[PDB]
């Protein structure tokens, strides 16, 4: 049947970037029409591949990752970037083959009091590896004395909330992001485009 791109792009709620979601796409027909013809995306950047030409290639599996960041940080969703998002939340490899799609979602993810449901990781001793997901909420020990699970001096909660508000400037507003990556294993190809049909 058709690949379920709609339930990724049109999901009611998105994940926080630190706990980014990933949908494994297999054994379906993928028509990328829906995406590249739709003039609804402020970001549609593809690497080592073209959207025009995806519809006639075959892959073993496709991964669709999705999360919310602020517009300021959409530039960090790219190969070779650094920054809090790239270093501690979601990391693309330098040889990334895929596409990065994003759109402004102020009308869905901002609240008047501030939406404190979307978070990002602020402290981490080392950078994530490509496609690594770290969902720890352990108190960050910034000094030598153990924190014993209590926030305080040199003991920081590792996550911070975006607090998206509709009044915010467009650099601070929430953006929904979908990252499509294409993997070619030594195995049969299960995700292709369409073509002609008999009867």
């Amino acid at each position: 049947n058709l690949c379920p791109f709609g339930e990724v792009f049109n999901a009611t709620r998105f994940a926080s970037v630190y706990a980014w979601n990933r949908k494994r796409i297999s054994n379906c027909v993928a028509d990328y029409s829906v995406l590249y013809n739709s003039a609804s995306f402020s970001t549609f950047k593809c690497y080592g591949v073209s959207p025009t030409k995806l519809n006639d290639l075959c892959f073993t599996n496709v991964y669709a990752d999705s999360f919310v960041i602020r517009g300021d940080e959409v530039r960090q969703i790219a190969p070779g970037q650094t920054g809090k998002i790239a270093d501690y939340n979601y990391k693309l490899p330098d040889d990334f083959t895929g596409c990065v799609i994003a759109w402004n979602s102020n009308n869905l993810d901002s609240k008047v009091g501030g939406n404190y449901n979307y978070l990002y990781r602020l402290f981490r001793k080392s950078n994530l590896k490509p496609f690594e997901r770290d969902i720890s909420t352990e108190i960050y020990q910034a000094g030598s004395t153990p924190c014993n699970g209590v926030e305080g001096f040199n003991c920081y909660f590792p996550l911070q909330s975006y607090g998206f508000q509709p009044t915010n400037g467009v650099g601070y507003q929430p953006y929904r992001v979908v990252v499509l990556s294409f993997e070619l294993l030594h195995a049969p190809a299960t995700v292709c485009g369409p073509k002609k049909s008999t009867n």
Partner: antibody
């Protein structure tokens, strides 16, 4: 009890090099964001450089390519290597504990760098 | 590039009076504003972060308010220690920038 003590400032000719050092205690250097901020004589404050907890590095446009920030955790020391110095670089240089690349909650005492012929 | 403008440049008051210092931002920075205090020859000291939260050990007479492009630092009852230069700093957009400072002078 946080302590930061900068050292290494002095007179240098334009085009020369210097390495400032900041001896820190009361926290784990390798575990924190740290920044260098400078203040020209009688002028305001200008952020110079930052090292993230995870090791990433960022610089102000006026010093990009010439300055390099680094740390040594066993010595508990932060370093700023300045090359190809210009007259405009004359300032007191402050070492600072940086909370998540947002604000500077602990400052050293500063070290004076004079770049002149 | 966010430019911060502080007003007034100099403010002259007697000990015991209330001090009101203004920071204005060229763009919205929404709450990502900090205030620092600097006495002559000494290093700056963090007073307020998040536009309204006091740092550790800072007396209650220091308070911060505002948002977006307009911020205010108030000292309720001026003590002699409080006569210094005060700097606003924004961290809503890279690179972080400071205002040019407000000098608080003793009136006599």
């Amino acid at each position: 009890q946080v302590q930061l003590v900068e050292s290494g400032g002095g007179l240098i000719q334009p085009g020369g090099s210097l390495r400032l050092s900041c001896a820190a205690s009361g926290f784990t250097v390798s575990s924190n964001y740290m920044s260098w901020v400078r203040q020209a004589p009688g002028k305001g404050l200008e952020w110079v450089s930052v090292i993230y907890s995870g090791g990433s590095t960022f610089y102000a446009d006026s010093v990009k390519g010439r300055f390099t920030i680094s740390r040594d955790n066993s010595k508990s020391t932060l370093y700023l290597q300045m090359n190809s110095l210009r007259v405009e670089d004359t300032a007191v240089y402050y070492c600072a504990r940086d909370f998540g690349d947002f604000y500077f909650d602990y400052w050293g005492q500063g070290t004076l760098v004079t770049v002149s012929s | 590039e966010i430019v911060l403008t502080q007003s007034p440049g100099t403010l002259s008051l007697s000990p015991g009076e209330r001090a009101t210092l203004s920071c204005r931002a060229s763009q919205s920075v929404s709450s990502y504003l900090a205030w620092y205090q600097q006495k002559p020859g000494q290093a700056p000291r963090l007073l307020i972060y998040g536009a309204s939260s006091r740092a550790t050990g800072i007396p209650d007479r220091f308070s911060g308010s505002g948002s977006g492009t307009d911020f205010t630092l108030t000292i309720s009852r001026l003590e002699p220690e409080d006569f210094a230069v005060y700097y606003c700093q924004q961290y809503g957009s890279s690179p972080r920038t400071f205002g040019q400072g407000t000098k608080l002078e003793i009136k006599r």
